[PDB]
Amino acid sequence: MVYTVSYDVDGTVIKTKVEAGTRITAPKPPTKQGYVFKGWYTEKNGGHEWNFNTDYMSGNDFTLYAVFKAET
């Protein structure tokens, strides 16, 4: 089974197809001027960080959301 992982970077979404039960290969990390990339999360707010080393592709399409933190 192959599903789509959508990568959403502040609403810009890129779709990649991934075989269920395999590890997902992370994209090159996004960048945002004045901000720091904090990782890919299962929700834009209130989810958890996907760990591409430990995590396995689900048997469904899903979206990973880039989270950024302002530089301080």
Which residues of this chain interact with Ca ion, rule CB under 5 A?
A: 10, 43, 45-46
For Ca ion, which is the closer residue by CB, 18 or 65? Answer: 65
Q: How far is the CB of 9 from Ca ion (least distance, A)?
A: 8
Neighbouring C-beta atoms of residue 65, cutoff 10 Å: 20
Q: How far apart are CA 18 and CA 60, in angstroms?
A: 10
For Ca ion, which is the closer residue by CB, 19 or 43? Answer: 43
For Ca ion, which is the closer residue by CB, 10 or 49? Answer: 10
Q: How far apart are CA 58 and CA 55, in angstroms?
A: 9
